[PDB]
Design a protein around this ligand. Sequence first.
Ligand SMILES: *[C@@H]1O[C@H](CO)[C@@H](O[C@@H]2O[C@H](CO)[C@@H](O[C@@H]3O[C@H](CO[C@H]4O[C@H](CO[C@H]5O[C@H](CO)[C@@H](O)[C@H](O)[C@@H]5O[C@H]5O[C@H](CO)[C@@H](O)[C@H](O)[C@@H]5O)[C@@H](O)[C@H](O[C@H]5O[C@H](CO)[C@@H](O)[C@H](O)[C@@H]5O)[C@@H]4O)[C@@H](O)[C@H](O[C@H]4O[C@H](CO)[C@@H](O)[C@H](O)[C@@H]4O[C@H]4O[C@H](CO)[C@@H](O)[C@H](O)[C@@H]4O)[C@@H]3O)[C@H](O)[C@H]2NC(C)=O)[C@H](O)[C@H]1NC(C)=O
Ligand SMILES: O[C@@H]1[C@@H](O)[C@H](O[C@@H]2CO[C@@H](O[C@@H]3CO[C@@H](O[C@@H]4CO[C@@H](O[C@@H]5CO[C@@H](O)[C@H](O)[C@H]5O)[C@H](O)[C@H]4O)[C@H](O)[C@H]3O)[C@H](O)[C@H]2O)OC[C@H]1O
Ligand SMILES: O[C@@H]1[C@@H](O)[C@H](O[C@@H]2CO[C@@H](O[C@@H]3CO[C@@H](O[C@@H]4CO[C@@H](O)[C@H](O)[C@H]4O)[C@H](O)[C@H]3O)[C@H](O)[C@H]2O)OC[C@H]1O
Length: 453
Amino acid sequence: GTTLTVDLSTTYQRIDGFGTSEAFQRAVQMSRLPEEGQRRALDVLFSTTNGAGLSILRNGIGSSPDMSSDHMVSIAPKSPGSPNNPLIYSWDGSDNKQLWVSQEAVHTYGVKTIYADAWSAPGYMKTNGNDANGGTLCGLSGAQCASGDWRQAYADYLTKYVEFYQESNVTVTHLGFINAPELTTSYASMRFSASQAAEFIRILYPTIQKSNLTYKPTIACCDAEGWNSQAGMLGALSSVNSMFGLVTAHAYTSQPGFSMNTPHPVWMTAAADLQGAWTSAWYSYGGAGEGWTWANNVYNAIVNGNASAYLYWIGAQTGNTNSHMVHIDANAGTVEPSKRLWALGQWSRFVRPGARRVAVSGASGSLRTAAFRNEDGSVAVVVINSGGDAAVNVRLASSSSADQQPASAKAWATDNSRAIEEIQASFADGVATVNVPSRSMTTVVLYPAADAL
Ligand SMILES: *[C@@H]1O[C@H](CO)[C@@H](O[C@@H]2O[C@H](CO)[C@@H](O[C@@H]3O[C@H](CO[C@H]4O[C@H](CO[C@H]5O[C@H](CO)[C@@H](O)[C@H](O)[C@@H]5O[C@H]5O[C@H](CO)[C@@H](O)[C@H](O)[C@@H]5O)[C@@H](O)[C@H](O[C@H]5O[C@H](CO)[C@@H](O)[C@H](O)[C@@H]5O)[C@@H]4O)[C@@H](O)[C@H](O[C@H]4O[C@H](CO)[C@@H](O)[C@H](O)[C@@H]4O[C@H]4O[C@H](CO)[C@@H](O)[C@H](O)[C@@H]4O)[C@@H]3O)[C@H](O)[C@H]2NC(C)=O)[C@H](O)[C@H]1NC(C)=O
Ligand SMILES: O[C@@H]1[C@@H](O)[C@H](O[C@@H]2CO[C@@H](O[C@@H]3CO[C@@H](O[C@@H]4CO[C@@H](O[C@@H]5CO[C@@H](O)[C@H](O)[C@H]5O)[C@H](O)[C@H]4O)[C@H](O)[C@H]3O)[C@H](O)[C@H]2O)OC[C@H]1O
Ligand SMILES: O[C@@H]1[C@@H](O)[C@H](O[C@@H]2CO[C@@H](O[C@@H]3CO[C@@H](O[C@@H]4CO[C@@H](O)[C@H](O)[C@H]4O)[C@H](O)[C@H]3O)[C@H](O)[C@H]2O)OC[C@H]1O
């Protein structure tokens, strides 16, 4: 058959993981399900045995004065009048039901990475006095406000949000202070130039470092709406590379098809078929909503975009578009995962946080392949097959040390009839032999002996 040979001596980027968000009250929609539906939604998103095993949760740091519409209410919704006055914290113990999703992800399912990102400062900290319709943080260069300089106040505010999570037994590991800073919208939005982002990082970094936080989160920037627009910000950010540790961008205004010039890991923190009519299918024709298409979008972001993480926009939500991976029927209390959920899971279940991408060779024309060395020494080989059933052999390069060689192997596939379903991995003297199904994403995992006799 086709032999795929993994070269552990040729390494690329680290994989931090895969995930999604329940921002803008999508967590509230989950919380309104019956207890059984709540558990099924959480299981399909986070279960490492029977769901997508998503390893990252991205939360919104609420900017709004109330929970009107789908707004995320701020921890400090009321202005103290002046930035000289202590901020007025009005904690609701909920954070728009994201705290509950976070507590389940961490304490029930073992998630260790929690990315909190503000779309806006509270309106009283901004040039336009509103968390929506753009505007800029008061006190930045070119944004001097009558009300005063709110830059330190915003840093104190973000630090306090992380502290409220910490006191609710969730560690925020990564912290963002803008989203789509090039875009004014009718919802939470805030305009920063790349130079303004650098200016604010110089204020936020020492604020975090001097804080009483148990774990100092890594600062991220800037959740631009595409690879091209985020890459355009890196020049101005380069003066503060010592003060942040994560580059973030979405896949809307351009695709993650090149490696950004930055020393930091790069995360693709939001993508979706936002406009597309709901489909649950894995493959119909390669349309924008199909699970097959999304398995390939992840492949492209990692292999071509040099991404260390991949987050779909929303996990579970109501509504009839492909903005989300898991459909909620609010009336019926039902939860239906799309094959986009299983696409991301077919990655996330087997490519665990800290995995190192490694070279794999031997792919025929209908196969696209990638390989990952997990921290535990298990080697996950991704095979995306556009053709018919394909007989594949999976092995390490002969130069591998004998104790890196597998003692066992398993395989799982997702396709039109399978959701991360185990398939036969016949194992002979270090070689896994697998029938990769037609139009599937198959992951073959080679397991060393480790401490087992
Ligand atoms: C695809 O994406 C990849 C990223 O996902 C990308 O990889 C990046 O490649 C660049 C280019 O090669 C690498 O840049 C080098 O980095 C070396 C330092 O690396 C170590 O430190 C990094 C930063 O660590 C901070 O951040 C971490 C996470 O936030 C924390 O865990 C740390 O605690 C630390 O935080 C602290 O510091 C912060 C300030 O930085 C601060 O805010 C914070 O509060 C805190 O105080 C780590 O990320 C990095 O980790 C990697 O490697 C380790 C070890 O293997 C792995 O375990 C990790 O998993 C991870 O992969 C390291 O710990 C620099 O030393 C190096 O500079 C030297 O070489 C250049 C030329 O290339 C010289 O110009 C320069 O002068 C330096 O010279 C010195 O050393 C050389 C040795 O060759 C020597 O010859 C010379 O004489 C001199 O003494 C360079 O900058 C970058 O690290 C990669 N990032 C990552 C994440 O791996 C890749 O390029 C992309 N691919 C493509 C094709 O684009
Ligand atoms: O309920 C609310 C949620 O809906 C909400 O979600 C936000 C919805 O809007 C999202 O932003 C959209 C992202 O997609 C963009 O369309 C892109 C635009 O760029 C095009 O590419 C260009 C093509 O032409 C070239 O010359 C040019 O260089 C390219 O850039 C691309 O083809 C389109 O797909 C929309 O314009 C955005 O509106 C946003 O990310 C979501 O967060 O959140 C709030 C909640 O209340
Ligand atoms: O030998 C046993 C193995 O077979 C078993 O493998 C696991 C079996 O469960 C797998 O997780 C599945 C994933 O699919 C879920 O159901 C889907 C829900 O969405 C629908 O669209 C779709 O049609 C359904 O199939 C299911 O709830 C969940 O359990 C898991 O990935 C396999 O590893 O492990 C135990 C062995 O003893």
